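Margin note from the TA: students keep mixing up input and output lines. Inputs are the sequences; the output is the structure of the whole complex. Example:
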Amino acid sequence: KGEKDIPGLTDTTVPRRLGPKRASRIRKLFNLSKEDDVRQYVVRKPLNKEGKKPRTKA
RNA sequence: UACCUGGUUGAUCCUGCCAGUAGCAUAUGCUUGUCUCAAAGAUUAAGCCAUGCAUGUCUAAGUACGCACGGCCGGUACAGUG
């Protein structure tokens, strides 16, 4: 990147969906030791659609 | 059912072939009411091919973060069907 902002590209940011799934890749992104529960730090997709209940998928 | 019969001469006896006769298989003609099985683009061109179909596959048990549905309970790693 230079110094300006191109309006079609740079100013937005994407939610990079689908976090890590293998239990070693969780600890590489969150820096857990052995005694930390990996399932404490799992990413949950904030799922939402009209006409339906708010659901959360992991 | 281990079979013969007409044809050479004025007449005869033979050699001998032609012709008939009976199946069986391919075609074909004329005809064809019922009923049971049944072959069927081999022969000529292993010639040429429109179109469509003829090879796919998930259990409890390889991989599910598709809400595509719905379901507890909403900090519940993953309910489930898929």
